[PDB]
Amino acid sequence: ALGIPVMLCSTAGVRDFHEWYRDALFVLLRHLINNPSPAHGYKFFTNPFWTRPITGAEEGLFAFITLNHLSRRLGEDPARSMIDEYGVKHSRNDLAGVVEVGGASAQIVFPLQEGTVLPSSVRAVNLQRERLLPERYPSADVVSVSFMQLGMA
Amino acid sequence: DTEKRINVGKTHLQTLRNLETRCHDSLQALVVIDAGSSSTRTNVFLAKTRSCPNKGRSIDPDSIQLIREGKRFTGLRVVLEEWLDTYAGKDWESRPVDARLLFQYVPQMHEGAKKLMQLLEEDTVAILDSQLNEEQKVQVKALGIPVMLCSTAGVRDFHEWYRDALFVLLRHLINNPSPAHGYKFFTNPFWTRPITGAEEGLFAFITLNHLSRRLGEDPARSMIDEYGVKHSRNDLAGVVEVGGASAQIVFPLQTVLPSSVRAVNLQRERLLPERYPSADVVSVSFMQLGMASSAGLFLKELCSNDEFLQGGICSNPCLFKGFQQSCSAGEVEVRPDGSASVNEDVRKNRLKPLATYCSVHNPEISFKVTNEMQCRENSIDPTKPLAERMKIENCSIIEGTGNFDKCVSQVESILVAPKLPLPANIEAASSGFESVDQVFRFASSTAPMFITGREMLASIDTLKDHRLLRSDFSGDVEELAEAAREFCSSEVIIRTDGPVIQLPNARGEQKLNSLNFDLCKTMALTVSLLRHMAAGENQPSFIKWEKSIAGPDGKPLADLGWQVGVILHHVLFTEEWGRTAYEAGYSHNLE
Amino acid sequence: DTEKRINVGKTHLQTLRNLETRCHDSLQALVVIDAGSSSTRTNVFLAKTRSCPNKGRSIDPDSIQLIREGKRFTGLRVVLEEWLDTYAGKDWESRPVDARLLFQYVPQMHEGAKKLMQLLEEDTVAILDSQLNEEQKVQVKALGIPVMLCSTAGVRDFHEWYRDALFVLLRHLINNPSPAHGYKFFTNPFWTRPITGAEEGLFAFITLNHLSRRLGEDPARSMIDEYGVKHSRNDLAGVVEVGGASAQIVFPLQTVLPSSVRAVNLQRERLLPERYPSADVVSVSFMQLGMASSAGLFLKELCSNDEFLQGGICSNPCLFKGFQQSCSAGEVEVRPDGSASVNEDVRKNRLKPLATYCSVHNPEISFKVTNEMQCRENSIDPTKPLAERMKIENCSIIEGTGNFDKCVSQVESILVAPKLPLPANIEAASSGFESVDQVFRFASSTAPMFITGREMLASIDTLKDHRLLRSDFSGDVEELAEAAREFCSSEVIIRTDGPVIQLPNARGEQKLNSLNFDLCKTMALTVSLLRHMAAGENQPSFIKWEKSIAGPDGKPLADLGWQVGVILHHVLFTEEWGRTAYEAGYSHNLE
């Protein structure tokens, strides 16, 4: 009755794929998901926001969110976060970083401790500013990097 | 008779009831501090705000008009470089410097930044006081003045934590103005921040299309189809902006792009709100391609080539016959006696930012081999000291040969299509473009193009004024190439009044100055740019060279650039602008 | 050593970065102009505002504290009545008046309203200047002062278009303050408007529960169940407010009600935002039941009954033995020689608003028979002139009999449970309540009750002070009835210093004044109110008599009434308050 949102995201496999072919395949994939078999009854659906090729850094940022969510480090509630005298919400426990090595790539993701001043060349990502986490969640400046040719295969 | 007296009292109540229900318009001043490469100047704008009951307050985008562009004060690079000279020690460019130790000099960096900010505040207040009446002044002082200081190519390539640390101090200086003047200036990390080359170009595109009435959400500038999608009435025009240190190439797609080419959607990347028509725009900026930066790099590369440097004399095809200057990239001044004096000051040298970047002590060169090879291709040795880097080895005098065809082929191989990308262009390389030639080979559009830049306009105007080019000139490369070929083959004769450029076949003459002496290099840049634009799969409908765009009154309401774009980028998001500019406002800074 | 110097500079940048990210607190003044029946006074409140980056500005509800209640200036009724005396002609109450003709006197109504508004502004500024430091003054003057002028029972029953026309002029006067003082006062039709009796009571309920920490959205004052429904931690307490012209009975339902009884849901009727706990509250207000209004009506009805009026002498059971006053509802002053002087001034008479309403020339009586019969039941003849209406026919002196039981039975039949509803009570009749007795017979709740009103408190306090009632007193009617029966049977003896009330059986004594002489009428009102409260299906957990509620500091932050409630009613709707108070603000009034 509610419908099944589908999120097909390609990783390192077709990240380095030449010409238009990869992005053209994604338009076709979404159409295939949006038109499922009416026999089973399961109402599958997608959009260009859910089904799209995710970047190496994006892949790493989601791996960070997954880790901190399951380990109960990330949260908005008073059990996982705290609001100071200046209305700024801080996480009760330290946000943990991740190192994920897959088939084709390796991700190195870690949050910076109270905005560690970085050089002009180093481009860090703020979770709330880059719309990864909503305003109600505690703020964190995270360095997310992925390296091709580092995966096991 | 008595009924009319009753109607006066009824109107008295109706007029008073109107005020309670109607929207009241107030005047607000908006400040954009252009922290460019050459200088840091203030831009004072006026806009009409509309406050409606239960609807809030919002700026009318079409009411945005520039009052005046302020004095050209010290650039942010000079500010940071003096701080390094005074605290890290002189000639820090040739020595390895520990950045960790420089943290004990942050209040010292703040005191140096205070010097420039007090001058900009004094200048901003001067513009406001002289160009506003007492009624307007009350309105402006009551609403507060949002300030947007954005650094461009001047400190884009700046090393270490320094640049971003200076910005935190700059915001604090703006948020604490002089209480004497009454003008309530205020800022935040969203308004005052270093803007990327792509951002600089995107805002320049918004400015162009806004003033030319191409961009808009109203039914006069946009149309909604049967499927609820809003399309713009007229084609969105692209822009080519060549500043002091960088050149921007921006155009909307009217197109399937490769995986490597990363285009920007205005609504998805939150540049324009959802209510505005959607457009996928390619925005690219090239460092070492601005008027000052390209001048230093061209002279360095050309006067290192054995095809031009012979017996200490570098033969410059971009300079007029009879013209000669000292072999250095220093600031050229054309003296009244016909001579060209080259400034010896290391900071007033056009190679300084490139030689400071291309240093083995900069972590961007010592750790990254790709960047080291980029510097070496432009003859710059990062291992050698700063003085040796800017030095044109075995060269004393630069002699002008006036060969335009040779000048084109050189600008082509050096600036337009080089072997490796020009230094500090990782931002352009990430979007999928190593050089200017790659832009049109990978991405092309039929969208009309606009050419912006003081010297870019001067190049076309000079040829139009001397009747070499038609007044009704399109993007005809052959017409431009032949007209410039005749003009650049002119002889310089030192006359009784001063240096005069004499056109061949007794066509005409004009005075030689510190701005037009190397106009032929900019002319060659235009030719090679239009050549690559013509080479593309899709060619623009028309190419236009305009100084400013006339408004409904006839007078141009604002100048072309990123200024209006950055205002629109924040003001158009109604809910978000209302909170930061009016709900929080200058009252947020109350201690 | 050197690492600590580096850390100072690192902290310098961290502290500066905190300011850019953190929420800054500013102080704002809030003005509530109580346009009551007896007078028009200003209430100056202070509150802490919080501005957060990208989140906007909002008032902390628990930071709201009253500075001072201003001087008791001219009531809005007197203002309108003088305008009618001067433009429609004197004794307009006894003559038919054409309302259409009075429209030519709107600027004249504005000039009269300007007189009062300049005094209130002068008084408001005086409170602010004397009770704020220079730092606080800057914050207050920069944010702007929202003004909420709400008229109560004084002009609730006012005839024709006049009252609503005056309000349009009042808002214009507030929106245009003196520029000399610097305090930026501003209003709108949402803040400055005539509040209904039910609204007056609902805001009094919000005030009570806010200060007593019963109402709140935080986990300290509220709890969320497994089904996402937020419930209040402690039971929401009801209120009984007896002012100058009206009495309010407000209580939350903790209940299935008949179709005729129309209860108000706080979230559905937009009194409290969705985030606050839900409550269905019964709010009812009765005209002719306030301290001044009930005094005039009681004397009129009692001294028309042949059971009390005999040979020109009306025997008053609510007045002490030995006390005597002239037979009129005029303002009673207890002179130092023991005598009670009754004011002859027609406006300074307690029957004036009832006699002005109960006029055959008022469209509410001439067209509506139901209202005409209501007036006649209270002995008022709408056909007869104003002087004859307020006149107690065939009566010269009022003699006090001091019989409390007889005083209760009379207040009961006259004010609590009359044959027809008291005049101008269509608002109460629409909700399903003709009289005070009907309130508890149709709607009952176990919710604790609070009693508010100067004389209501004085009634219980006097008995506690003379040791007739326990210090730990609940809503025990028998305890109160016996204590008052002894106190009201006291003899008045004119002593050497002045008039003194002497308690029976040598219990004690106190000085007789213009406030306590008729305290026994208010005592009878309390008895009959608690009797009907006990008669109800559901009885309140406890009945409390409190002057003010102590805050966290120990000092009461604000007084009980509709003032804090009306502030909370607007300030708690974050998005809506931010737009009207900060986005629009005083800057909306800029001409």
Ligand SMILES: Nc1ncnc2c1ncn2[C@@H]1O[C@H](COP(=O)(O)NP(=O)(O)O)[C@@H](O)[C@H]1O
């Ligand atoms: N008075 C003036 N009017 C118009 N243009 C003027 C001027 N003085 C210098 N200029 C020109 O502006 C340019 C300044 O560009 P910048 O904004 O400093 N360079 P970027 O950081 O954006 O790459 C220079 O190329 C210079 O030739």
Ligand SMILES: Nc1ncnc2c1ncn2[C@@H]1O[C@H](COP(=O)(O)NP(=O)(O)O)[C@@H](O)[C@H]1O
């Ligand atoms: N100084 C004073 N302090 C406290 N209460 C005072 C006072 N002077 C008069 N009062 C009392 O306030 C009441 C004023 O009520 P109002 O608000 O004028 N009447 P309504 O329109 O709300 O029905 C009077 O009953 C009077 O006894």
Ligand SMILES: [Mg+2]
């Ligand atoms: Mg610039």
Ligand SMILES: [Mg+2]
């Ligand atoms: Mg009142």
